[PDB]
Amino acid sequence: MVPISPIETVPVKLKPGMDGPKVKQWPLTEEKIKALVEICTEMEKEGKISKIGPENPYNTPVFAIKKKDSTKWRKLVDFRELNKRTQDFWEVQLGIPHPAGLKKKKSVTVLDVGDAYFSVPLDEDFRKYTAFTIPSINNETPGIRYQYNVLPQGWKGSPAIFQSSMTKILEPFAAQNPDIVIYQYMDDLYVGSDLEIGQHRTKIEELRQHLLRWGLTTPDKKHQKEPPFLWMGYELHPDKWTVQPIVLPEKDSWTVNDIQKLVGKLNWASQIYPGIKVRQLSKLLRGTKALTEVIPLTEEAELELAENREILKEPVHGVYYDPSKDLIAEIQKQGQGQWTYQIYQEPFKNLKTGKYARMRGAHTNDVKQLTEAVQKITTESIVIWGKTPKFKLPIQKETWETWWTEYWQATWIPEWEFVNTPPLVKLWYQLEKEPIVGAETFYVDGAANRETKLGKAGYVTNKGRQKVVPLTNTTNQKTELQAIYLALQDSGLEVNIVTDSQYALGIIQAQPDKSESELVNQIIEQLIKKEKVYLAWVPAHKGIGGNEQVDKLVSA
Amino acid sequence: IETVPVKLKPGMDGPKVKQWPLTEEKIKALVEICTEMEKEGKISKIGPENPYNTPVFAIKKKDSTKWRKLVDFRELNKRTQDFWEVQLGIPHPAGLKKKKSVTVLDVGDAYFSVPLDEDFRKYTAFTIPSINNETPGIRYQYNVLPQGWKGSPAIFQSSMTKILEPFKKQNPDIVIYQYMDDLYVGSDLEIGQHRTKIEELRQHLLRWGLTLWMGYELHPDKWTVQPIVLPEKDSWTVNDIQKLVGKLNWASQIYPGIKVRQLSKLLRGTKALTEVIPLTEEAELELAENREILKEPVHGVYYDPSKDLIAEIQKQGQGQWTYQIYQEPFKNLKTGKYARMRGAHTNDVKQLTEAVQKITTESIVIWGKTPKFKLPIQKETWETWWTEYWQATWIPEWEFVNTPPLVKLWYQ
Ligand SMILES: Cc1cc(-c2ccc(C(F)(F)F)cn2)[nH]c1C(=O)N[C@@H](CN)c1ncc(CO)s1
Numbered sequence: 010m011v012p013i014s015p016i017e018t019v020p021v022k023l024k025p026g027m028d029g030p031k032v033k034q035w036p037l038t039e040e041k042i043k044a045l046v047e048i049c050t051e052m053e054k055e056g057k058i059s060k061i062g063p064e065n066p067y068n069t070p071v072f073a074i075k076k077k078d079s080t081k082w083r084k085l086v087d088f089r090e091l092n093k094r095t096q097d098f099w100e101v102q103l104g105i106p107h108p109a110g111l112k113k114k115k116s117v118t119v120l121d122v123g124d125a126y127f128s129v130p131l132d133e134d135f136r137k138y139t140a141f142t143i144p145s146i147n148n149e150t151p152g153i154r155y156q157y158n159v160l161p162q163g164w165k166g167s168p169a170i171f172q173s174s175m176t177k178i179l180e181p182f183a184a185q186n187p188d189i190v191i192y193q194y195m196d197d198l199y200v201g202s203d204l205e206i207g208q209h210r211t212k213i214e215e216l217r218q219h220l221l222r223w224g225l226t227t228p229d230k231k232h233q234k235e236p237p238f239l240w241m242g243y244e245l246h247p248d249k250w251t252v253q254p255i256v257l258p259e260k261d262s263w264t265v266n267d268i269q270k271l272v273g274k275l276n277w278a279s280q281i282y283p284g285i286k287v288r289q290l291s292k293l294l295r296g297t298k299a300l301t302e303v304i305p306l307t308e309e310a311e312l313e314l315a316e317n318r319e320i321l322k323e324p325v326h327g328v329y330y331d332p333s334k335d336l337i338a339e340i341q342k343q344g345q346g347q348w349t350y351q352i353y354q355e356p357f358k359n360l361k362t363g364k365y366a367r368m369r370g371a372h373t374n375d376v377k378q379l380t381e382a383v384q385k386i387t388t389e390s391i392v393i394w395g396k397t398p399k400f401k402l403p404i405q406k407e408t409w410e411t412w413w414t415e416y417w418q419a420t421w422i423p424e425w426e427f428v429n430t431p432p433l434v435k436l437w438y439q440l441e442k443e444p445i446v447g448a449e450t451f452y453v454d455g456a457a458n459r460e461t462k463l464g465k466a467g468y469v470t471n472k473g474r475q476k477v478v479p480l481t482n483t484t485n486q487k488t489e490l491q492a493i494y495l496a497l498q499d500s501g502l503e504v505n506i507v508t509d510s511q512y513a514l515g516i517i518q519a520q521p522d523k524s525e526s527e528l529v530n531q532i533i534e535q536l537i538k539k540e541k542v543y544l545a546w547v548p549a550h551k552g553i554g555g556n557e558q559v560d561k562l563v564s565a
Numbered sequence: 566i567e568t569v570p571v572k573l574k575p576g577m578d579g580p581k582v583k584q585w586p587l588t589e590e591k592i593k594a595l596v597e598i599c600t601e602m603e604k605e606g607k608i609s610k611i612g613p614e615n616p617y618n619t620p621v622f623a624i625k626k627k628d629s630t631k632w633r634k635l636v637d638f639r640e641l642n643k644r645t646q647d648f649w650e651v652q653l654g655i656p657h658p659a660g661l662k663k664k665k666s667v668t669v670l671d672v673g674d675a676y677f678s679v680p681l682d683e684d685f686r687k688y689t690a691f692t693i694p695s696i697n698n699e700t701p702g703i704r705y706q707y708n709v710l711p712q713g714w715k716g717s718p719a720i721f722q723s724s725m726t727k728i729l730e731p732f733k734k735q736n737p738d739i740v741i742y743q744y745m746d747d748l749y750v751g752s753d754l755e756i757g758q759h760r761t762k763i764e765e766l767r768q769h770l771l772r773w774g775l776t777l778w779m780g781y782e783l784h785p786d787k788w789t790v791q792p793i794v795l796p797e798k799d800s801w802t803v804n805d806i807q808k809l810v811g812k813l814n815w816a817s818q819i820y821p822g823i824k825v826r827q828l829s830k831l832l833r834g835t836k837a838l839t840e841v842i843p844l845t846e847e848a849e850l851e852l853a854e855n856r857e858i859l860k861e862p863v864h865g866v867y868y869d870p871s872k873d874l875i876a877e878i879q880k881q882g883q884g885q886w887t888y889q890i891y892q893e894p895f896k897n898l899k900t901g902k903y904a905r906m907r908g909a910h911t912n913d914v915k916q917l918t919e920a921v922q923k924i925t926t927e928s929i930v931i932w933g934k935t936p937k938f939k940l941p942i943q944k945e946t947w948e949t950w951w952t953e954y955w956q957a958t959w960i961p962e963w964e965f966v967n968t969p970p971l972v973k974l975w976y977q
Contacts, residue, residue, distance in 0.1 A: 019612050097616035101692070101701040103583065110697035169613035176701055192699040377943075384949045388586060395589030395696040417969040419880050419913035419942040421950060444804045444838035452835050471837040505838045507807070511971060518969040545838065546971065547807050548814040551825060554803075554833035 013224040016128075017177065019170045021135040023094045029067040030090040034142040034152060041073045044082035045143050048073075049155055057127060061140055061154045067091075071141045086141050088163045094138075098169040106194055108243050108250035109352070109361040110393040113329040114190065114201030116209040117247075120217075120233040123196050125225040126171040129160045139164070168195075175225075182219045186212060242277060249326040251281050257318065264303045268293065275317060281327045282320050283362045284341075284349050289313045328358045336398035338386050340379065342432050348382045352390065352398060363389070372521035372529065375434040376412050379404060383422045400425035404434040412436060417518065437522045438536040441543040448503035448541065449474070451496035452555030455488025455510070456564045465563040466491035469555060474499070477562050486512050488563070490528050493517075497535035497542075504542060509549035509556050517544060569720050571682040572646045579617040579688040580640040584702065587694050591623040594632035595693050598623070599705055602634075607677050608705040611690055615706065621691040622952050628779060636691055638713040639960055644688075648719035655722055657933035661740045664751030665786040666759045667930060670766065671777055672725075673746025673958060676710040676717045678774075679724065689714070712746045712958055728773050732766055744929045746958040751785070785930055791900045793819075793859045793975075795852065804838040806831055812975045813855055819895045822858045827851035866896040874898070874936035876924050877966075878917065879973045884910065886920045887976040890928060890936055899931065900976070908954075917942060918954040925961050938963035 023029065037045075052058050071086040131139070139157035160167040175193060183191045189212060192199040200216065202209050217227035227233075237246045242253050255274060260267050272287050272294070279285035289309040297304070306314075334354040341349045346367030353359045365382040367373060383400060390398045402409075402425050413420050444450075450471040457464025457480070466488040467477035476495055480488060489510035496506050508514070516529060524530045536542060547553050549560065573579065587595075602608045620637045648654060661667060681689070689707035710717040718725075722743065729741055739762065742749040750766060752759050763780060770777065793816050795809065810825045810832065817823035827848040836842070844852075869892055878888045884905025891897045903923070909915035917940065925935050940947055944965045 019614050021614055096614065097581075099613045099616050099618065099690075099704065101613075101704075104698035106697045106699055110699070166613070172701060173613040193701065194698065381943070381945055384945045387949055391586040391588055393697050395587075395592065397588070413913060414882065417880060417941065417973060418966075419917045419940075420946055421912055421914040444802070446839040450803075450835065450838045469835045471835050471840075507838070514971065515968055543838070545804060545807060546811065547832075548811055551810060551814065551829045552833065553807065553810065553829050554831075555835040557833055558835060 014222050016130055016174050016223055018130050018132050019166070019173060021132045021166055021170070022096050023091075023138065024096055027094045029138045030069055030094060031066060032068055032070055032090050034068060034144045035070050035072065037073070037144055039146055041082075042144060042146055044073045045071065045084055046153070048082070048084045049143060049153075053155070057159050058155045058157055061137075061156045063151070063154070065137055065140045065154060065156065067138050067140045069139065069141045071143065086161065086163060088161065088165070091138055092163075092165040095165045098166050100169075101172070102168070102195075104392065105241055106192065107361065107393045108245055109327055109330060111245075111250075111329050112190075112201075112332060113248070115203050116206050116235075117199065117201035118209065118213050118233055118235055119238065120198050120200070120213075120228055121196055122171075122175070122198060122225070122227075125175070125220070125227075126160050126162070126167060126196070128224050128226065129171055129174050131157055131159050131161070131170075133158075178220060178223050178225070182216055186215075191216075246326075248329075250329065251324060251326045252278055254324070257314075257321065262303045263293075263306060265294065265297065265300055278321055279364050280361055281359065282325055283351055283359070284343065285317060285320060285364060286313055286343060286347050286349075287364070288345050288347055288366065325359075327362075328354070328360055330354075330360060330394055332394075336390060336394060336396060337401065338390065338398035339401040339428060340382055340386075340403065341430060342375065342379070342403060342434055344432075346373070346378060348378060350382065350386055352386070361393075371526075372516060372519060372524045374437075374520055374522040376404070376409075376436070379434050380420055380422060383425075387423065397423050401428040402426070402434075403428055403430050403432070408434070408436055411439070415439070416520070437533070438520075438539070438542070440517070441541050444505050444543050444545065445503045445541050448505050448543070449500055450505040450507065450555070451500055452507045452559050453489075453492035453496045454508070454556060454559040454563045455485070455490070455492040456560070457483050457485045457488050464488045465565075466495060467559060467563055468492060468496045468499075469559045469562070470500075475562075486510075487528065489513050490516075490526075490532065492563070494528060494532050494535065497532060497539065500539075502540040504539065505545065506542065507545045507547060507555055509547050509560075511546070514544070514546050566680070568680055568682040571685040571716055571720075573644050573688070574646050577644045580619050580644060581616060582618055582620050582637070582640050584618060584620050584692045584694050585622075587622055589696060591632075592693060592696065594623045595621065595634055596703070598632065598634045599693060599703070603705070605677075607709045608707055611687075611704040611706045613704075615687050615690045615704065617688055617690045619689065619691045621693070624952070624956055626956050627781070635955070635958065636689075636711060636713050637960055638711070638715070639962070641688060642715040645714070645716050648716060651723070654719060655743065655933070658740045658742050661742045661749060661751050662785055662931045664740060665753050665784065666756065667740075667749055667751035667783045667785055668759070668763055669781045669783065669926070670748040670750060670763075670770075671746060671958070672743065672748045672770070673712040673717075674777055675725070675770075675774075676712060676721055676746070679710050679721060681707055681710050713960075715745070718743055718745060728770070729766075732769055736762060742930075742933070744933060744959070747929075749930060783926065783930065785927070788901070790862070790897075791902070795856060795859065800841045801844060802839050802841055803832065803836045806842065807838075808974070809852075815972070815975050816855075816859065819863055820858050823855050824851050825855075863896060866898065868892070868898055868932060870932070870934070874928060874932060874934060875939065876921075876928070876936040876961075877939045878920055878924070878941060879970065879976060880913065880917070880941050881973065881977055884916060886916065887973075888920065888924055889976070890924070899927070901927075914942070914946065914950045915954045917947075918951050921951075921961065921963070922955070922957050925957070925959065929959075935959060935961040937961065939966050940964070941966050943967070 069086055069088055069091055073082055074085055075082055136156050139161055141155055142152040144152045160171055179191055189200060189202045220227055244251050244253055268290055272290050275285055275287055289307055331354055338350060338352045343349050348365040351359045351362045365385050367378050387397050405427050451468045453468040455466035462482050464480050464483045465477050469475050490513055493508060493513055547556050619641055622635055623632045624635055626633050686706050686708060689711055692702035692704050694702050710720060738752055740751045750763060806828060810829050813823050813825045828851055831842050831845060831848055872892045874890055874892060876888060876890050878886055881887055886903030889897045889900045903920045907919055921938055928936050938961055940963050
């Protein structure tokens with residue numbers, strides 16, 4: 010017999026300050042007990058389990074479900090209670106590889122290891138806590154006691170100990186075979202190469218030899234699959250990849266389930282199908298918290314699902330990564346805070362696509378949103394391809410230059426060029442840095458009563474122009490804004506505006522181009538129309554000449 | 566050559582921080598660096614029975630073009646015991662702040678010759694990430710004392726005192742302070758001659774590696790704290806006086822006596838912003854008294870080593886950055902301004918990153934602690950990019966300012 014190399018044992022302990030599991034073995038029907046005595050007998054003679062005596066005080070229940078459409082009973086232990094007590098293991102299973110990241114190899118072989126996790130030894134100091142009891146017929150003898158000698162399925166540490174061991178074994182094979190690539194994700198091992206299919210299946214055979222050296226049995230006859238594959242909701246073809254074809258559900262009174270199964274499903278399609286929008290469908294969700302509630306489609310929803318549909322009609326495919334070619338990412342503004350993007354290396358053939366939704370904010374502008382999307386795409390690309398893509402953005406170079414140079418915050422986007430695909434992201438207004446000579450000076454103020462919620466807003470100017478408007482159902486903050494809105498509405502194309510509202514300053518200096526507040530959007534609409542606007546702040550209740558006389562006028 | 570016992574403080578598990586994505590070249594650089602470190606015994610591979618993780622990435626230090634490994638030990642440093650067993654840590658030299666020149670020497674490589682407590686090694690675990698989650702991460706843990714850990718200087722300090730006991734023997738003029746992986750060497754000495762006794766220390770360091778090649782030359786006496794200045798003009802517009810009244814009002818929170826009653830009376834009436842107004846004689850007096858008030862330092866502003874140091878930074882344009890360090894609002898313990906010329910004549914984030922590094926350095930020199938930053942930048946932008954310009958072996962804490970402060974005008 011050719012000797013087996015032993016697989017190194019991973020030391021395991023249960024959580025600090027926790028005992029083992031002691032749960033009682035369910036009452037099973039006579040036929041089910043008969044099934045598990047059969048199963049455990051072969052697995053014992055296979056070295057995978059072994060009977061334990063009455064010393065072991067730990068117990069995990071075991072059940073037997075019956076294989077559907079087949080008369081093969083198979084076994085199930087519910088390790089939930091021992092999983093709760095076991096130490097935490099390390100989490101490298103942080104992500105799922107994205108198809109757009111795979112490099113196009115000419116031959117690729119995938120081998121499933123749904124078998125090998127059971128040939129890997131379990132730490133013997135830990136086997137005592139894997140104990141389970143097969144209840145005897147009529148409960149007239151002590152149930153036969155068993156413990157595991159190897160990684161049990163359904164146990165917390167099995168997937169991490171299995172992959173750690175597998176990687177240990179794969180190192181020298183991959184190192185001494187640089188002409189291949191081996192990726193290992195969950196129970197499968199992906200092997201690709203750029204040599205002829207002949208020397209591929211030879212080195213495939215060689216690897217299975219290499220894993221026999223550790224006693225890990227490998228799929229042989231057929232079994233190991235070659236492209237294409239249905240994998241993790243994708244379709245992996247030799248030259249191409251795309252979303253598994255998954256079609257939209259249909260109802261007349263759409264419930265919460267109805268599109269919790271359709272935005273999460275249109276999110277999926279948005280990674281290869283360009284231009285998929287989700288907003289008018291998700292407003293319907295965050296505003297409720299009932300897993301059963303129905304509510305009709307909004308007037309803008311079925312216009313969007315009609316746009317969605319017009320996209321999921323033909324199959325669009327994605328290319329695999331070529332590390333020798335440049336990475337390109339292109340963004341399009343789609344409206345209502347929605348952004349779409351395509352990542353590719355040559356025109357017309359995307360590696361992947363996607364979208365970005367604006368952050369829940371009170372105010373915002375287009376440049377900030379484009380910046381945020383650039384950052385999202387940047388991190389996605391480093392994840393998938395290990396480098397930052399070159400950007401093509403719908404913003405003029407001079408637009409970006411005036412923005413970043415005059416923005417109070419620090420900001421930056423990496424290397425990028427302008428692409429003239431409207432709607433272009435624009436700067437809609439720019440405040441002056443110094444007062445405008447010859448422009449009317451509007452001293453504005455507003456004030457409200459915390460009890461009646463009544464108030465007044467207005468202005469006094471240097472030409473003697475005045476206005477004070479009475480207002481109902483308003484606050485001090487609203488009137489301060491309204492005063493500025495009035496000055497803008499009533500002044501020429503150039504105007505100096507003096508206020509004491511630190512609240513208003515904070516909103517305007519942030520430079521929003523759209524707002525939740527109806528009143529801010531009016532001000533924004535007025536700013537866009539202006540030629541030059543200088544906004545000056547003074548401290549209140551110092552009676553300053555202008556912002557003393559109008560303060561009085563709005564609280565009278 | 567034996568371990569010193571190291572714990573964490575009870576009730577606290579080891580760090581479990583997720584590794585963030587890395588560019589391909591950074592991963593490659595780390596693989597090469599860690600393969601050698603593994604060969605030299607400084608680190609060893611680790612199994613999945615280690616649930617702890619600390620992020621790692623790779624840089625290029627100042628005036629050097631080969632990669633260096635940096636481990637963000639910020640979370641582990643929080644959870645590490647405070648080392649006051651024999652000594653209460655290194656007491657900060659108040660004289661280091663007072664020297665005309667101070668220079669920083671990377672001594673971190675000396676930590677790699679002293680073993681770390683075998684019981685503690687499991688908490689230094691880090692992960693070289695893979696691209697696209699293709700292969701699992703390469704996991705290591707430290708066997709030697711790691712650069713960036715707050716325990717490394719604490720443990721090495723006993724064994725570093727002997728290394729300098731000959732040097733401060735001959736030069737009682739020279740204050741030497743150590744912080745993390747850095748040695749700060751200072752003197753009231755001449756500029757050409759301060760370079761001379763330094764390189765001496767460089768070799769006196771090589772003699773004991775028998776049993777680290779360049780320098781950063783700070784000058785903590787070449788500058789000082791910054792006063793509030795008011796304009797000096799012969800003709801004032803309404804706008805000018807409005808801005809003046811605003812800054813005086815703001816400074817009246819810091820200084821007690823700032824009067825703006827004489828100046829604000831000029832502002833009464835609704836005049837055009839660009840209209841000149843002569844200064845009332847009592848307004849001229851009031852501004853004169855405010856000036857004299859602004860020339861004395863703030864009264865009763867004390868450093869408290871029990872509280873956090875806060876650093877705020879304002880972007881002012883054209884490569885200039887202002888900053889203030891304080892513990893209580895309006896009681897700045899230092900203020901200053903950042904200049905330009907250092908990269909990023911078109912990259913705001915590189916400027917801010919360099920600004921954060923300089924402020925931390927000055928903060929290490931003055932108090933022996935790093936401050937918590939308030940950064941004028943969106944979290945998502947900062948987070949994405951700050952590691953590509955970071956060069957220091959330490960890392961401060963920071964939060965993000967999303968509302969434009971009115972104070973940017975007053976520190977301009
Ligand atoms: C034939 C095949 C190739 C692969 C693969 C391809 C690429 C990569 C990597 F490493 F490149 F990311 C890793 N594995 N998986 C499969 C596959 O059929 N897996 C089956 C069970 N063996 C299931 N997956 C999810 C299921 C229920 O949810 S059942």
